[PDB]
Write a protein that binds this ligand. Structure first.
Ligand SMILES: CSC[C@H]1O[C@@H](n2cnc3c(N)ncnc32)[C@H](O)[C@@H]1OP(=O)(O)OC[C@H]1O[C@@H](n2cnc3c(N)ncnc32)[C@H](O)[C@@H]1O
Ligand SMILES: CSC[C@H]1O[C@@H](n2cnc3c(N)ncnc32)[C@H](O)[C@@H]1OP(=O)(O)OC[C@H]1O[C@@H](n2cnc3c(N)ncnc32)[C@H](O)[C@@H]1O
Ligand SMILES: CSC[C@H]1O[C@@H](n2cnc3c(N)ncnc32)[C@H](O)[C@@H]1OP(=O)(O)OC[C@H]1O[C@@H](n2cnc3c(N)ncnc32)[C@H](O)[C@@H]1O
Lengths: 124, 123, 123
């Protein structure tokens, strides 16, 4: 019953720039970018932030640029595991740094990053 | 950035809408949400966006769950203070929209959860 | 309606079940969940349903992650007072199911989280 934090990031996939065709292709695109930026930060701080990535669409007003029925998006989540990181604040600052880097590399005008309290049970 | 997020789980009612794939039912729910969100936005100036995800929900087959699980859609959202000036009013709007979604999807039941969250919005 | 939700993340072990697509992985994991949930329901009269979502999980390639991520499934659920009287007993049941799922999926590790939530159930 370790009290910790989870994050959730939502990003567009910018098909106008990366020209991905399917949701598997955009999932792999975002996953590859996260894999690179997470490793780069891990080399600097010894904190590796893994991410679960999920296909999704995001529904907003068509006048703001949303396609009918929703924009293709990826949801990234993760959770601070005390077996891997000993400082929750540093982990949180790392997630924020990665979220801003993801926004930049995905060429997104906006991005959301949330933190939620969670109780993590890790079975090994 | 302390705020609220919601999560709604809905069936896709294949027998009523006659969709044939997870992608089609995702777009069905997306279109319904897009319409009810716009309709409410016109009445109150509050627009509730939703992230929608494909899913399968597993429960007891004795209660009607299909062998391979029920095709469902998960909808989530979060109150951003840049777009809504009162979180409680936003929460009440989400509840209203969830009940509308339940009715439009012809669902017998629906869950709508609220979770405390800290939102960081980069622009 | 203050309560708890769970989230479990599991690998899908394509190298033990010979599967490929994400829809096929949802069906494999959903079938396992149906069976273990029913088994626990018979013992405790607590049935834990699950919403299952397709995903990939990104971690260091040096630790065995494929480039761009490993195929995974995310399972979530929520304790509903209409179906369970004691949230502590529900939580212990979820933990038992999570450990059983880890074994059935032949996974070296598994995460199970509990998050405070406010559930609105419309029926
Ligand atoms: C789908 S399970 C696969 C991998 O997927 C990641 N993962 C699992 N569940 C989650 C979750 N809920 N949210 C985010 N990432 C997750 C974790 O990185 C997990 O790694 P393991 O715990 O299985 O360790 C595997 C190896 O990798 C090392 N390792 C895994 N993660 C980290 C880490 N963050 N820092 C340092 N070492 C790590 C660990 O020591 C071990 O040798
Ligand atoms: C995947 S990002 C795309 C759009 O997807 C939606 N979105 C992004 N992240 C999330 C999330 N975590 N949960 C739910 N919806 C999300 C947001 O509606 C977002 O819009 P932006 O923040 O990028 O604003 C784009 C334009 O649209 C306006 N706008 C966007 N949302 C609202 C809103 N709710 N009310 C009023 N104006 C809004 C805003 O002023 C701007 O001009
Ligand atoms: C996508 S909706 C379909 C079914 O999907 C499951 N479900 C719905 N929302 C969620 C959610 N957020 N998380 C996890 N599971 C969910 C629920 O099991 C739901 O069942 P209903 O509430 O609609 O009851 C349907 C029938 O099944 C019985 N039933 C459903 N769940 C349980 C349960 N946990 N214990 C006892 N009886 C249960 C209930 O009495 C009724 O006859």
């Amino acid at each position: 019953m370790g009290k910790t934090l989870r994050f959730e990031i939502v990003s567009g996939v910018n098909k106008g720039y990366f020209h991905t065709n399917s949701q598997s292709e955009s999932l792999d695109l975002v996953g590859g970018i996260w894999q690179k930026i997470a490793k780069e930060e891990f080399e600097k701080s010894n904190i590796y932030v893994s991410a679960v990535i999920k296909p999704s669409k995001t529904v907003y007003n068509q006048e703001w640029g949303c396609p009918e029925n929703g924009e293709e998006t990826v949801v990234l989540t993760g959770v601070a595991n005390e077996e891997f990181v000993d400082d929750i604040e540093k982990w949180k600052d790392t997630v924020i740094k990665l979220a801003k880097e993801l926004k930049n590399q995905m060429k997104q005008s906006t991005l959301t990053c949330e933190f939620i309290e969670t109780e993590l049970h890790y079975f090994k």
